[model samples]
Target: SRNDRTLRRMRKVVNIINAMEPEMEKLSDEELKGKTAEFRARLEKGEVLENLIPEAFAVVREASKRVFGMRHFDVQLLGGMVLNERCIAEMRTGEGKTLTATLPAYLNALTGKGVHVVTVNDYLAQRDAENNRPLFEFLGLTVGINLPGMPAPAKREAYAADITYGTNNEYGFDYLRDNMAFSPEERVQRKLHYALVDEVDSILIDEARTPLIISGPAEDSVLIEELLVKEGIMDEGESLYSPANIMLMHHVTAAIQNENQTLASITFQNYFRLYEKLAGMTGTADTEAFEFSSIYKLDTVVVPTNRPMIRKDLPDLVYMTEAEKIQAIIEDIKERTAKGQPVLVGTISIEKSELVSNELTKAGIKHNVLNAKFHANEAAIVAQAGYPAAVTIATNMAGRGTDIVLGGSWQAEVAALENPTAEQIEKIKADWQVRHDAVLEAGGLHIIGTERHESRRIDNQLRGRSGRQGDAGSSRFYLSMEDALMRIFASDRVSGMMRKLGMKPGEAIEHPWVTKAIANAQRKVESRNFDIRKQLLEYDDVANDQRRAIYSQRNELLDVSDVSETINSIREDVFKATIDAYIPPQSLEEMWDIPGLQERLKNDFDLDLPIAEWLDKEPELHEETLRERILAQSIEVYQRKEEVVGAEMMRHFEKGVMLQTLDSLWKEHLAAMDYLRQGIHLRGYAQKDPKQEYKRESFSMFAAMLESLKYEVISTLSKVQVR
Candidate 1:
């Protein structure tokens, strides 16, 4: 397999980096940091970047030890090489994907072009930059993070850095805003050179569902397929499209949220298509390896782990109802707490996490809950989740990217050292070191899931929190037939199996086939979701093309010093169309509509040329010659008006008019196109394919829209006051 080939090649590179490490460690900090300039000089002298990878990686790895007291393992070196090749490096959780990224980031930033490290959430976006800045600065590269609520000047400074870290939301919105911006200063991102997406699957697949750019729930009515027959297009059935069914479609369209998912899906996919080079890192990407390869063209390279995984994945327990599931989960938490083991309970939502907290409170169990409402203290809560007997209930997506060590973290201790020096931090770590051993003796931290998430990736992430750096651990999911996934999508199959087994309420089933069934059901939904996103892409591909054209022209108008030249072009086009309408190509006399031409020219251009003389006196008029004559006369009228208004002021007025006209018409055009997509399926029953019909009619709609813009700009500029 290609992945096998990549792993072998990466292993060779890792060996080179490992061999260079001993020599690298002997260098002083100044010489170690100076290696950056040396390597860059080598590149300028015609050395291929691949040849410098090992040395560059060795530099970063050793610098990491001095700065963060952590060095890249051999396996991390392999993953770093794979990522530098612009491929997906599927390093398992706690394998230091964040650390591995510094190698490639430093290597790529050597070219003086920026690199973007994409995170799934704002927390990691900011955290990674702060954590990795020392190594980056030691290598002589500036690092910045995309911060929310940052002023425009600050945003430009961040993008101007050699390396930037930001969430997909930040970068994606910045892209949208860049295109929508009125000035170059308003644009906040450099050209997207390299995107190193951390937790690649989450940002590329999961967060793609968070749509922000949409003109919400396009009330924007859509017709059901069954309505086509009622429109008398096909095998006509005098059935539904009744007022009740009509209201159903109307309400569904008005209240729809999933449409935003489809929009965001198109956006992420389209954004991926924009990248010059893209790579992602994740522990659980292999589960959806097919998706990673097929959508993003990222080859998945599974790097060998530094330590063998010994985390026990216990069989999932299923109960007859959610209440029973909660009961079983609470009982297990009690058992873990009895043994002094820290327990982490994962729930699907804030309400559920809070509910679990409330349930634990019934037993007077002291615990902390990390949910949507309590997310402000995400780091502090997750940091202690590993301490002995600490019970923490957290929603699945909250506080991810924060490691949960089996022992308590030094982060809390380090943070509390307000006026303490460097040794104070290390002293706290040493004191916590004994607690780390005690945590391991308590059978490590145990993970409990209240319910399965719709995406296996989220479940994998929740499970990953328990097992880190080969620590002793176990994870169990307590589920019920009444859970969201089971209740909505898979309960019938499982419920039938339960009935055959004669399972009663509050009874539990922990069979192997039940686990297999649960996985199969998740697989089913994952596939449907993948298909829906693709279907949405097919729908938006049309609009994306049109959007590019309209926005590009809007930009062109904005960039030009004067758009009077464009207005003159419109004037010429209108005159030619009028001449074509009134004059015949091969005409004797009487073939011309002199009266109609006179009326239109009077209204369209404020010109009252004596067309009667041309029709009556010019015996025979060649169409080309006549068009030139009318256009020349129209130019004279336009110039006469421009001089009266001062050409400089008229030019300024012309630019404003063009921009305003373009923006107004284009917005109206987008809304129309939005509705056009919503309702075009009505044509499918008329032996018309919706895609073809939409393409054909949308092309015409766009053409007609441009014509309207041209006419409005010309007429308004011609007659309106400059002020």
Candidate 2:
């Protein structure tokens, strides 16, 4: 109990370091860099870092204040140390996690081993690196940032740096690509090294199911083609009417009433006309979207924030038919822009992005549209989105990485302020600078969700763009029941509940319980995903063991230049196998089947010598003594062959031949193990666990391979050449 209390007290100390705001503010930038050097020296002196926790934390806390003018609370320092220790640091949002990671990253990088900082997307990776570069560079450590679409040389350079920053997908995909290299020297990464993964739950738990894969084009499958044809022909019925749909209709009715338009003219007429309008507008409307045209009649509802959303709101007027929703949205965009309020619209698809851009052009509303295909220009467009009166339409990529700072009367004051001292004030100035450059260069980074993401994490990642680290920003999702996540995963019961509540379609719902329910659903899916990854790791563990053993032995043989003695060992093994199988142990009268045993041994080893006759002559000898005689004779034969090759040359030949043989056998064994795992599921039919059966069978096969390797090495060394 006393020890437990001590540990608790130690933990409290970390929290104190994380929470020390004022003291951190007092540290100079040089002092912060000195702290990194101090921790490195302590780690080298054979002292446990766990015991030096408090001082190690104080070092980073002071560094953050000096480099970034931000201070971590004591709890944040604890998280930093946990991350540094190569464990998951689960911190809540609004906690200073980004800053916390800097502490451990700096500490670990001192060992001359590289550290990897992983983010969820390219934008976050670049943004985090750029924002924190000052602190890292201040400490004399090199920092490199990588994003998707970079050239090969650039990626290599980034990975070569002391600390490399990139997204999870980019890092994993690079690893897969490296493994396929023809030569080990062609690989870019050094090793797995230390990694501090941002959004640990989302990346490790949520996205771990699908391993990043690299492959050349595979042969097309006729079966898949046939299945695709069948799927195309299947006629799925319409979804049942639920309460959410009713509520959606109610919203449309209210909007029509507020505008003094009759329900039949705006709502009913719009419902029937959607198909024709969509067909005319897009030329080829998707079957699914066409089927749910009635659902799209309702406008997306915008929930008010805890603080006032100062963005201008304008009237959206829908025509008497479903085809009019697009026109209404476009008109609303133009109206808001005319009033000097910047408008950021979200669309779901590349095709939709183009269509909206076309509408904006027709309406002569100055705006920008972004899509996945044109992401090469993302940084530029995202930068320019923060102007005083801008209209921007972009995909969900706009959400996570960039902050949207408002431009108003404070723009001049924010622009004029140089080296602001107040921490919050400086952060505000930094946000303004980033947003201003974004608008002037590319455009402002504003997020619009064209559709709802399957998981709430993705949605939150998108929303996180606007009010990043507490900036003046706002975000709202525009969804139709026709959206994919709703169509696939949203239950009919939830829709029914919404309809029975008489909520309008465009009326925004801000109940805390609704948010909680959505998050709970995401957690359930995330848990299931984690179990899948655990199962994969369990299977890989069996293979990893076999691989390590084979590789280790191969390395040993390659290093040992002489193999004459090793060859003699194989000859002895053959002799022993024959005697044990044929000769009776106690009684020579039980004269064993020596000839049959020799025949069996012949199939595995090319032993043409008269081993059976010799064993029979020595039947009275004990098993151990008889084995020693066989080994002595084998050694004589091996030496004679080595002499023929002139010992020196034979030594060189053995290394070359043995390494080649090991490689060939190991490759074949890997294949056999893979095939065994595939068929091992049949064990379940016998009321046995398939995994257990796999483990047993895999181990037996590996042992057999090892025996084969021994035989091959012995046989090859016996026939060594003298070229």
Candidate 3:
């Protein structure tokens, strides 16, 4: 009922932004740049941030006009306004999310705290940051990029800028590493400020579980296991897990893990919660409104497009089998390409894309294939994807974040020239204009989905690649009962209906109900995945607590100058454990294993003790006296080490050893947790709650990890000797 409330307010603000555009355009460059300082002054004068949105948004539109020779449309302004309100704005493709972001980014950076622009990939993050740098910098806002593997000083510089751009993974990991920094200066990120995420659905929902090929029919892994055992590669009754088949176990385990599990992941839903304010834009968000609203508490507002979207989305053509669907898709491509309309066939995977590619080759049609394998020339291929008689096969997610411009991207052709003359550039544009009109006359880009994805958002994105900017286009999804989605969830009833209707081989069924049924199936799959992500987040929350505890204590250790007291504290614990392992506490003399204690100290902590010799000299030495004597000798040895390297140097060494030891043990602990999580569900067979068992097991593992941290650090410190 309140769905339109956000749109109503957005419309009001858009009017204000538009009303100021003319006035802002009248100002000269110097006067326009003056607005930045004025906004800051006003903010410091106790002005409300809400009151500044209209003027701030209007100023950005004018700045972009002067810098890029383009202006933000009314819908783009609405998008910016909605984003400023901390909402997910669903803007269609070709609406220029990059430009819309400049509005809120500039608005928020006025507080002098900073703004972070998050995108899906490094290329897009850098592309948007560099492309929009002139526009933002012209308004006196600094822009920076935080890429993977950047040096600490470089990242620090990047994070200090007013607006920073980076990928989702890099941003999350940087936050973690910042908490792990040895010093404040070593930390790169600042407080969690405003984050404007691009491709919101992809980052927030699709990748929530944290990150396969089909087509070639391969036998099951269980069959391979039996074959391995039958071939005498292992004992007759043994499985793949054995010392003789360690390499085999690795291969099998990796297959199972990749096919069916996640390893040490933090969902974007939880990772991005670090931000104080979050907003994002995407072409397909309405389908995931519930997820956005429930998980992030962000409303999804569909911003109307500047130009009317006239894309003709045809009904699904359901077939009896995958073979028939592929043939039917080829027929459609042949018809469209013959008429000079560019055809873009979207497949669900790399193997499917290649399957279509092979079919196109057999049909004697010239085309380009874009998938993970042939990504070297992706940009060039997508640039020319709209040419007349051009055909391209691509996976659903391939070549995204780039638009397919009608008339074959003339800019690319011009860029190919080495310092072309103005006349040469004009000739290229003239040629492109003719091609563009020709494509328009031939009915713009045609999209063909070889199969539907499990999520409707991906299918919508596939359709969106065509009919951009109100261009005339058409799209249709080719589905079959043999498709994975159909076979698993919606096939039984639909296939039964088809058989009842006397459907024959190679015939397709097309109707409103057919399409509706398929969409319902996708909805079911989406809900299931949402539950999975929610469950994953719940489990990760337990680990997150451990993460927070360890990081806080780790930061404390990093900030301190001397860890000698900590070292001494843990030293006693380690020695006490070593002593108890050999010499049982409060046991009779007959139970004492003094030789074992001496050997353990020498091997583990690098402390040499002549216990047997000492026992010969002192006949009355009991457990208490012997314990005191052993501990005294250990302390003397440690003091000698401090003397060899001065006390300050010793302190520095101890801190370094502790830090390094903690980091390595933590890494190992992560692997252990991963293994534990992968198989923890089996606890349910014993009627135990997997979640509760996981939490209990993880806590004990963490406790053991902390103990090992102390033991390893003390042992390393004791084993070292100065020259």
- Residue 241's lDDT in candidate 3: 41
**What's the residue-level lDDT of 123 in candidate 1?**
90
The residue-by-residue lDDT of candidate 2 on 393-462, one tens digit each, is 7655532455444552234444557755577566766776654554433322344454546555556555
Q: Return the top candidate by TM-score.
A: 1
lDDT tens string, model 1, 241-277? 3321333344446653344211211266666556788
What number of clashing residue pairs does each candidate have, in the order they appear? 0, 28, 0
RMSD of each: 7.8, 18.3, 9.3
TM-score, each model?
Answer: 0.76, 0.59, 0.70
The best-first sequence of candidates by TM-score reads 1, 3, 2
Models sorted by lDDT, best on top: 3, 1, 2
Q: How far off is residue 303 in model 2, in Å?
A: 27
For each candidate in the order shown, give its overall lDDT on alpha carbons: 0.75, 0.54, 0.79
Instruction: lDDT for model 3, please.
Output: 0.79
